[PDB]
Amino acid sequence: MTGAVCPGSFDPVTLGHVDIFERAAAQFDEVVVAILVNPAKTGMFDLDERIAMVKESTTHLPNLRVQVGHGLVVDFVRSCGMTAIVKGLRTGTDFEYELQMAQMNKHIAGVDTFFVATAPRYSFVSSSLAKEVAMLGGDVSELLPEPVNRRLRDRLN
Amino acid sequence: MTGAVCPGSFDPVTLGHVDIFERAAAQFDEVVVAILVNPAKTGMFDLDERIAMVKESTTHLPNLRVQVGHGLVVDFVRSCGMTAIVKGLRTGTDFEYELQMAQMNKHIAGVDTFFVATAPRYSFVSSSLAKEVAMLGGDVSELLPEPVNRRLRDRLN
Amino acid sequence: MTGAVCPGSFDPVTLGHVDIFERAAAQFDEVVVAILVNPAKTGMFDLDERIAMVKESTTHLPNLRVQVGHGLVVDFVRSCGMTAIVKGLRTGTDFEYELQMAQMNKHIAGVDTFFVATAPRYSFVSSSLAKEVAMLGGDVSELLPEPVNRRLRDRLN
Amino acid sequence: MTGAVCPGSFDPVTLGHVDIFERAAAQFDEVVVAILVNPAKTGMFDLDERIAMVKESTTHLPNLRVQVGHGLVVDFVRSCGMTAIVKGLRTGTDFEYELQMAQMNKHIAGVDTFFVATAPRYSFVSSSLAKEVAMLGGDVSELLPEPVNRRLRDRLN
Amino acid sequence: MTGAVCPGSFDPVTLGHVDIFERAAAQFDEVVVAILVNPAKTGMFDLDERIAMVKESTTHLPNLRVQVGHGLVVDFVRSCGMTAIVKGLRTGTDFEYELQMAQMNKHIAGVDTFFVATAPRYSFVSSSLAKEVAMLGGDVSELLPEPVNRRLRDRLN
Amino acid sequence: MTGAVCPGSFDPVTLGHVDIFERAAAQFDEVVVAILVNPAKTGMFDLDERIAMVKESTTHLPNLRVQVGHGLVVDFVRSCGMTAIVKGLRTGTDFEYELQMAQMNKHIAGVDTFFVATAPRYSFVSSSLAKEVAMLGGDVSELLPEPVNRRLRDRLN
Ligand SMILES: CC(C)(COP(=O)(O)OP(=O)(O)OC[C@H]1O[C@@H](n2cnc3c(N)ncnc32)[C@H](O)[C@@H]1OP(=O)(O)O)[C@@H](O)C(=O)NCCC(=O)NCCS
Ligand SMILES: CC(C)(COP(=O)(O)OP(=O)(O)OC[C@H]1O[C@@H](n2cnc3c(N)ncnc32)[C@H](O)[C@@H]1OP(=O)(O)O)[C@@H](O)C(=O)NCCC(=O)NCCS
Ligand SMILES: CC(C)(COP(=O)(O)OP(=O)(O)OC[C@H]1O[C@@H](n2cnc3c(N)ncnc32)[C@H](O)[C@@H]1OP(=O)(O)O)[C@@H](O)C(=O)NCCC(=O)NCCS
Ligand SMILES: CC(C)(COP(=O)(O)OP(=O)(O)OC[C@H]1O[C@@H](n2cnc3c(N)ncnc32)[C@H](O)[C@@H]1OP(=O)(O)O)[C@@H](O)C(=O)NCCC(=O)NCCS
Ligand SMILES: CC(C)(COP(=O)(O)OP(=O)(O)OC[C@H]1O[C@@H](n2cnc3c(N)ncnc32)[C@H](O)[C@@H]1OP(=O)(O)O)[C@@H](O)C(=O)NCCC(=O)NCCS
Ligand SMILES: CC(C)(COP(=O)(O)OP(=O)(O)OC[C@H]1O[C@@H](n2cnc3c(N)ncnc32)[C@H](O)[C@@H]1OP(=O)(O)O)[C@@H](O)C(=O)NCCC(=O)NCCS
């Protein structure tokens, strides 16, 4: 089997992330979305909620599974019997840092990182900015999956 | 009327900012400098002081006014009856993040962002770096308006 | 009157360019599209055709006019009684070179350059790449105005 | 089958390219190296020589094949029954242009592009720079496959 | 005497840093490594330990000395009777910010900054990332001097 | 002796280049400006004129000498008994390509490259852009040494 891991904090998952999941699922036999949480309580959604949002947003991808990650991403990737990470590039991505992490990840565990450009319509959403705008009252519903929109609306109502 | 908003925390306003104010005032019928403060108390100058410093530094621009901003910048821009933001680019600007915010701002409110390169002599000052250097004893008086220099000198004397 | 010039070779004009024209026309009282041609015969469309394509693509912008430019862009801008250039940023833009030209243009003639991020859907088209793909048989009709599509199809039929 | 195409002019193939071939072959069931030549005679090695150099440099990759490409890369990719391109990133890569081409390629044919960072030791070689240095008398043998070194040495002896 | 200062927090010193020390020592008569610590207790190693690690890692450079820095780096540089800073560039370096600091440092004290590209094999290590990986259990021993490896291993055993 | 080479085509030398010469001469015992000309006749000024312009512009730097370079820059550097190149960074510099060349130069000859940020006032001039503007009638006299201005004015009169 070919396979890739798509790691992130997904707090919450965006349509930018889902686009990347779809591309990974199209090109690898199996995809694992690895939810890697904050070292210190700082998130908007708890882990259970993050998991549910990813699952509910990926029902159309039968070769994708969702799991909570622990420790070094490369250790999680190798625990999945894989050697590839797939990550998206968007507007605002710190690409130099992504490159540094990719080189470090290859050095320590031989894990490759494949980068893919997110679809233009979803290229300016990030979890952080979506939350920031949502919390100040703005509408980002067109940039997030409906399972995320539902939960966001509940927190503000 | 044509018009633009120049948003920032201006803590304190620099000659880099003033350069941008001048360019905006030269090209739009009206300019509003929007002072948008920290979500959490972290600034050097209080809001009243920031306002005074901007006003005192822009007496030569009769079509410019200064107001405190609240909430999403785009909501403030639209409250001013405008649809444009003017921002400066300098050495050290995270341009990828500026682009992300501009695209998000256009998405949520149809507000355009126009970027302009700050004058070379003022292209390496930032509020943060100016404060950092000032607090460690260095001289940045040539990079800040005199109304700011006066107040800075008072805090150290 | 406020006013801006939108300079380019427009060979041919793209929907990326038209997006920028629209933003300029929304924020300035008058816009002049300045068609500045090759120093040496190298273009796909002659000047007459470039002019027609821009005009036919901008009939919805009553405060926009199209003229052929000559010499330094800044000299043309000043001949229009203006002091501002508006240019788009897209994926693939050499932003460092754009900044260099903007600083040079300000130095020699006091002309300001305002940069605006092109709409995501039109952020990866360029005249060159559109021609390259079109000539190799690919479909970029969704990235160009219909007046350009008509003429392109004629050259290949 | 999963599969990826690795397109390039490979004039000549470098160890940077071979590194990318190896990563693609590790993660996809099949890899096709597509040699896409100059629209106008400008190369150092003819097509037959380029093909031989790639083949001789990839004997250790049994799931990799080499073919000459024609027309749009995306048309070649789809002719291979694939929907993915794998490309390397190195020091000196114009990443903005790579992104533009990737977005265009996805737009016109639905083909995804996966980018991977080349190994540090091979991150500063390019075909052009290798030729430039080789022609001026410098030693780049540690940056090129032996099948390429042999042929290079023959051209200078 | 010609001379340069190599400033940093060195928490801990990496082989990337040592590479830069070596290049500085090769090109200047004297080199001073200036250890500039956190304004607030946040480091892994105390100052005494940082000093020892640098000294033990540079025994092969007889024209290099190690000192603790205080205040503005430029003030320290001038206190050493020098007017040059040498800094490394690696993968992940925020080069725009480095440029801003260099321009500010030249403005306030006339101190020049010379940047040098770190050796490829050491181009993806940083003190922060090395600690992050080390603390999560990963092996970065090939990226750090043995005097640092010894101390790291002691903290985890 | 410490020493550095400052290589370039200098067609013509700009005040940006002279700024870099001055910084090199301040930090190294000896500086050699190496004029490396076009592989094919394409320049505005012949080699004799380029040499004269550099010499006449550097009379205030007694530890600087001017020589015509041949072949690989690293071979010229080593022929000068040196192992360092000093190059400027300005607005518009392709820094990724500079890094690639620096890494290649270190690989083939062990020669280090030190980069320094050009003074802001001279950060947007380049030989090419200066010629382009000069030829179209614009005034760049404030960006070039008087010995260059004299010769430029002669070509247009
Ligand atoms: C999970 C992992 C791949 C990236 O996770 P991610 O949280 O999805 O990160 P993203 O790509 O969204 O990057 C944005 C993150 O940068 C951090 N960040 C904070 N401020 C930032 C800023 N101003 N600019 C850029 N990034 C910022 C944020 O935490 C942000 O997540 P958040 O802002 O939503 O909290 C990575 O953290 C990881 O591998 N973790 C496991 C540990 C490991 O292996 N470490 C060694 C890596 S070499
Ligand atoms: C006001 C606004 C336009 C930008 O404000 P600003 O404070 O002037 O920001 P600047 O352009 O100076 O950016 C620098 C800011 O980045 C933040 N920053 C902190 N560390 C940083 C770092 N290492 N690198 C870059 N930026 C950093 C800083 O807070 C800094 O301001 P400060 O450092 O002086 O406190 C923006 O915050 C805003 O729009 N706020 C309103 C809310 C809104 O609309 N949000 C949605 C935006 S899409
Ligand atoms: C008109 C002007 C503003 C820009 O014109 P433009 O042709 O629309 O340029 P773009 O922004 O589309 O830039 C792309 C151009 O870069 C040139 N280019 C060629 N190869 C390129 C490459 N590999 N990468 C980037 N650009 C490339 C191309 O000619 C391209 O136009 P084309 O490829 O479609 O022919 C500018 O040329 C100008 O001002 N000209 C007048 C003279 C002047 O004032 N000069 C002094 C300027 S400081
Ligand atoms: C094959 C293809 C994927 C890239 O091919 P490549 O030749 O290996 O290109 P590289 O990634 O090595 O890019 C370097 C190329 O940039 C060109 N280039 C020239 N000067 C350059 C410069 N100063 N800077 C950067 N690139 C330069 C060079 O030709 C160079 O190849 P070469 O210099 O060795 O001749 C692409 O050309 C392609 O897809 N061609 C088929 C046609 C197509 O589909 N077109 C539409 C694309 S959206
Ligand atoms: C010492 C000095 C030259 C740089 O020191 P340094 O700590 O070695 O900094 P580096 O080059 O390693 O930069 C990385 C630093 O950026 C800071 N940083 C934090 N988060 C970061 C992020 N997400 N991205 C980039 N940098 C980050 C970190 O603190 C990091 O050091 P650390 O992460 O290991 O703690 C500079 O701080 C200095 O000059 N200090 C003296 C005061 C002075 O003169 N100030 C005026 C400067 S103009
Ligand atoms: C001399 C040398 C150090 C750089 O020389 P330089 O001509 O001063 O180059 P610059 O730093 O000014 O770079 C700009 C050059 O890029 C070339 N260039 C052309 N179009 C360009 C573009 N669109 N963008 C960027 N650069 C461009 C130009 O020729 C330009 O010089 P010019 O435009 O004035 O003719 C380098 O060419 C060299 O080392 N030559 C000797 C041979 C060698 O050692 N080769 C192996 C190098 S690893």
Side-chain angles (χ1 to χ4, degrees):
Chain A
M1 331 159 175
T2 67
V5 177
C6 295
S9 53
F10 309 111
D11 182 42
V13 64
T14 73
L15 289 177
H17 296 130
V18 172
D19 182 48
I20 302 315
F21 299 161
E22 291 175 349
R23 305 167 98 136
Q27 308 293 352
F28 295 83
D29 293 320
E30 176 169 14
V31 174
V32 180
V33 177
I35 304 179
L36 281 292
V37 287
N38 300 123
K41 192 281 176 181
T42 50
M44 171 167 297
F45 296 98
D46 71 15
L47 180 62
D48 284 331
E49 290 175 320
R50 296 182 204 189
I51 292 162
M53 285 185 295
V54 172
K55 290 187 191 296
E56 296 175 11
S57 298
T58 53
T59 63
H60 60 294
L61 305 168
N63 66 147
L64 180 150
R65 73 184 217 251
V66 183
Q67 228 301 98
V68 177
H70 306 275
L72 290 165
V73 163
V74 292
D75 286 346
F76 185 75
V77 169
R78 294 300 298 126
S79 293
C80 293
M82 299 175 172
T83 59
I85 291 173
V86 172
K87 311 195 70 179
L89 304 175
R90 109 281 168 136
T91 305
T93 294
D94 181 343
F95 192 49
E96 292 64 42
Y97 191 71
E98 289 297 333
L99 290 179
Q100 189 190 177
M101 284 196 299
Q103 295 282 15
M104 180 63 82
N105 284 337
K106 179 71 178 181
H107 173 76
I108 64 186
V111 168
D112 292 323
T113 302
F114 297 86
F115 295 99
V116 56
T118 63
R121 64 192 199 197
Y122 300 134
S123 60
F124 56 87
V125 68
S126 65
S127 298
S128 181
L129 190 59
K131 288 181 298 187
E132 290 171 80
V133 170
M135 291 181 294
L136 291 182
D139 192 349
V140 288
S141 61
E142 305 163 40
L143 308 180
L144 307 171
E146 193 64 4
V148 177
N149 289 328
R150 200 190 322 121
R151 290 174 168 85
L152 216 49
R153 290 166 189 154
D154 287 340
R155 294 179 81 94
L156 274 292
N157 272 355
Chain B
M1 331 159 175
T2 67
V5 177
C6 295
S9 53
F10 309 111
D11 182 42
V13 64
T14 73
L15 289 177
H17 296 130
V18 172
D19 182 48
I20 302 315
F21 299 161
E22 291 175 349
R23 305 167 98 136
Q27 308 293 352
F28 295 83
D29 293 320
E30 176 169 14
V31 174
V32 180
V33 177
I35 304 179
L36 281 292
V37 287
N38 300 123
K41 192 281 176 181
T42 50
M44 171 167 297
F45 296 98
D46 71 15
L47 180 62
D48 284 331
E49 290 175 320
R50 296 182 204 189
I51 292 162
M53 285 185 295
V54 172
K55 290 187 191 296
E56 296 175 11
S57 298
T58 53
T59 63
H60 60 294
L61 305 168
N63 66 147
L64 180 150
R65 73 184 217 251
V66 183
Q67 228 301 98
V68 177
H70 306 275
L72 290 165
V73 163
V74 292
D75 286 346
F76 185 75
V77 169
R78 294 300 298 126
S79 293
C80 293
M82 299 175 172
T83 59
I85 291 173
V86 172
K87 311 195 70 179
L89 304 175
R90 109 281 168 136
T91 305
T93 294
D94 181 343
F95 192 49
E96 292 64 42
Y97 191 71
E98 289 297 333
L99 290 179
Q100 189 190 177
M101 284 196 299
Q103 295 282 15
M104 180 63 82
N105 284 337
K106 179 71 178 181
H107 173 76
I108 64 186
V111 168
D112 292 323
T113 302
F114 297 86
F115 295 99
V116 56
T118 63
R121 64 192 199 197
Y122 300 134
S123 60
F124 56 87
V125 68
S126 65
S127 298
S128 181
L129 190 59
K131 288 181 298 187
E132 290 171 80
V133 170
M135 291 181 294
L136 291 182
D139 192 349
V140 288
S141 61
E142 305 163 40
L143 308 180
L144 307 171
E146 193 64 4
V148 177
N149 289 328
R150 200 190 322 121
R151 290 174 168 85
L152 216 49
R153 290 166 189 154
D154 287 340
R155 294 179 81 94
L156 274 292
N157 272 355
Chain C
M1 331 159 175
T2 67
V5 177
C6 295
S9 53
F10 309 111
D11 182 42
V13 64
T14 73
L15 289 177
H17 296 130
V18 172
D19 182 48
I20 302 315
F21 299 161
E22 291 175 349
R23 305 167 98 136
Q27 308 293 352
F28 295 83
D29 293 320
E30 176 169 14
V31 174
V32 180
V33 177
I35 304 179
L36 281 292
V37 287
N38 300 123
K41 192 281 176 181
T42 50
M44 171 167 297
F45 296 98
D46 71 15
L47 180 62
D48 284 331
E49 290 175 320
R50 296 182 204 189
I51 292 162
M53 285 185 295
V54 172
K55 290 187 191 296
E56 296 175 11
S57 298
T58 53
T59 63
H60 60 294
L61 305 168
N63 66 147
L64 180 150
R65 73 184 217 251
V66 183
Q67 228 301 98
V68 177
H70 306 275
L72 290 165
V73 163
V74 292
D75 286 346
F76 185 75
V77 169
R78 294 300 298 126
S79 293
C80 293
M82 299 175 172
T83 59
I85 291 173
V86 172
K87 311 195 70 179
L89 304 175
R90 109 281 168 136
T91 305
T93 294
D94 181 343
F95 192 49
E96 292 64 42
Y97 191 71
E98 289 297 333
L99 290 179
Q100 189 190 177
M101 284 196 299
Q103 295 282 15
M104 180 63 82
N105 284 337
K106 179 71 178 181
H107 173 76
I108 64 186
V111 168
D112 292 323
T113 302
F114 297 86
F115 295 99
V116 56
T118 63
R121 64 192 199 197
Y122 300 134
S123 60
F124 56 87
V125 68
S126 65
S127 298
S128 181
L129 190 59
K131 288 181 298 187
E132 290 171 80
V133 170
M135 291 181 294
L136 291 182
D139 192 349
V140 288
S141 61
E142 305 163 40
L143 308 180
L144 307 171
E146 193 64 4
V148 177
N149 289 328
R150 200 190 322 121
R151 290 174 168 85
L152 216 49
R153 290 166 189 154
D154 287 340
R155 294 179 81 94
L156 274 292
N157 272 355
Chain D
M1 331 159 175
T2 67
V5 177
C6 295
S9 53
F10 309 111
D11 182 42
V13 64
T14 73
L15 289 177
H17 296 130
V18 172
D19 182 48
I20 302 315
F21 299 161
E22 291 175 349
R23 305 167 98 136
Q27 308 293 352
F28 295 83
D29 293 320
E30 176 169 14
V31 174
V32 180
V33 177
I35 304 179
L36 281 292
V37 287
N38 300 123
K41 192 281 176 181
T42 50
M44 171 167 297
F45 296 98
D46 71 15
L47 180 62
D48 284 331
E49 290 175 320
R50 296 182 204 189
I51 292 162
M53 285 185 295
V54 172
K55 290 187 191 296
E56 296 175 11
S57 298
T58 53
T59 63
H60 60 294
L61 305 168
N63 66 147
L64 180 150
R65 73 184 217 251
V66 183
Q67 228 301 98
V68 177
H70 306 275
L72 290 165
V73 163
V74 292
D75 286 346
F76 185 75
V77 169
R78 294 300 298 126
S79 293
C80 293
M82 299 175 172
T83 59
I85 291 173
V86 172
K87 311 195 70 179
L89 304 175
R90 109 281 168 136
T91 305
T93 294
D94 181 343
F95 192 49
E96 292 64 42
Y97 191 71
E98 289 297 333
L99 290 179
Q100 189 190 177
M101 284 196 299
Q103 295 282 15
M104 180 63 82
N105 284 337
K106 179 71 178 181
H107 173 76
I108 64 186
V111 168
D112 292 323
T113 302
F114 297 86
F115 295 99
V116 56
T118 63
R121 64 192 199 197
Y122 300 134
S123 60
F124 56 87
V125 68
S126 65
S127 298
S128 181
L129 190 59
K131 288 181 298 187
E132 290 171 80
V133 170
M135 291 181 294
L136 291 182
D139 192 349
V140 288
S141 61
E142 305 163 40
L143 308 180
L144 307 171
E146 193 64 4
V148 177
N149 289 328
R150 200 190 322 121
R151 290 174 168 85
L152 216 49
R153 290 166 189 154
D154 287 340
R155 294 179 81 94
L156 274 292
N157 272 355
Chain E
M1 331 159 175
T2 67
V5 177
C6 295
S9 53
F10 309 111
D11 182 42
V13 64
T14 73
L15 289 177
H17 296 130
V18 172
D19 182 48
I20 302 315
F21 299 161
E22 291 175 349
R23 305 167 98 136
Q27 308 293 352
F28 295 83
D29 293 320
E30 176 169 14
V31 174
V32 180
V33 177
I35 304 179
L36 281 292
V37 287
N38 300 123
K41 192 281 176 181
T42 50
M44 171 167 297
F45 296 98
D46 71 15
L47 180 62
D48 284 331
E49 290 175 320
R50 296 182 204 189
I51 292 162
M53 285 185 295
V54 172
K55 290 187 191 296
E56 296 175 11
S57 298
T58 53
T59 63
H60 60 294
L61 305 168
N63 66 147
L64 180 150
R65 73 184 217 251
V66 183
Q67 228 301 98
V68 177
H70 306 275
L72 290 165
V73 163
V74 292
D75 286 346
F76 185 75
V77 169
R78 294 300 298 126
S79 293
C80 293
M82 299 175 172
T83 59
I85 291 173
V86 172
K87 311 195 70 179
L89 304 175
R90 109 281 168 136
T91 305
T93 294
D94 181 343
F95 192 49
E96 292 64 42
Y97 191 71
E98 289 297 333
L99 290 179
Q100 189 190 177
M101 284 196 299
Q103 295 282 15
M104 180 63 82
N105 284 337
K106 179 71 178 181
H107 173 76
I108 64 186
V111 168
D112 292 323
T113 302
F114 297 86
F115 295 99
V116 56
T118 63
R121 64 192 199 197
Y122 300 134
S123 60
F124 56 87
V125 68
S126 65
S127 298
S128 181
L129 190 59
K131 288 181 298 187
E132 290 171 80
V133 170
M135 291 181 294
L136 291 182
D139 192 349
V140 288
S141 61
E142 305 163 40
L143 308 180
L144 307 171
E146 193 64 4
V148 177
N149 289 328
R150 200 190 322 121
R151 290 174 168 85
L152 216 49
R153 290 166 189 154
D154 287 340
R155 294 179 81 94
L156 274 292
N157 272 355
Chain F
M1 331 159 175
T2 67
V5 177
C6 295
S9 53
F10 309 111
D11 182 42
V13 64
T14 73
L15 289 177
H17 296 130
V18 172
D19 182 48
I20 302 315
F21 299 161
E22 291 175 349
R23 305 167 98 136
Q27 308 293 352
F28 295 83
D29 293 320
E30 176 169 14
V31 174
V32 180
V33 177
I35 304 179
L36 281 292
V37 287
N38 300 123
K41 192 281 176 181
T42 50
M44 171 167 297
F45 296 98
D46 71 15
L47 180 62
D48 284 331
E49 290 175 320
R50 296 182 204 189
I51 292 162
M53 285 185 295
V54 172
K55 290 187 191 296
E56 296 175 11
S57 298
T58 53
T59 63
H60 60 294
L61 305 168
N63 66 147
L64 180 150
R65 73 184 217 251
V66 183
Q67 228 301 98
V68 177
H70 306 275
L72 290 165
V73 163
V74 292
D75 286 346
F76 185 75
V77 169
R78 294 300 298 126
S79 293
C80 293
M82 299 175 172
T83 59
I85 291 173
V86 172
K87 311 195 70 179
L89 304 175
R90 109 281 168 136
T91 305
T93 294
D94 181 343
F95 192 49
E96 292 64 42
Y97 191 71
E98 289 297 333
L99 290 179
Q100 189 190 177
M101 284 196 299
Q103 295 282 15
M104 180 63 82
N105 284 337
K106 179 71 178 181
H107 173 76
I108 64 186
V111 168
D112 292 323
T113 302
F114 297 86
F115 295 99
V116 56
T118 63
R121 64 192 199 197
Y122 300 134
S123 60
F124 56 87
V125 68
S126 65
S127 298
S128 181
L129 190 59
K131 288 181 298 187
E132 290 171 80
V133 170
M135 291 181 294
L136 291 182
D139 192 349
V140 288
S141 61
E142 305 163 40
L143 308 180
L144 307 171
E146 193 64 4
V148 177
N149 289 328
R150 200 190 322 121
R151 290 174 168 85
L152 216 49
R153 290 166 189 154
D154 287 340
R155 294 179 81 94
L156 274 292
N157 272 355

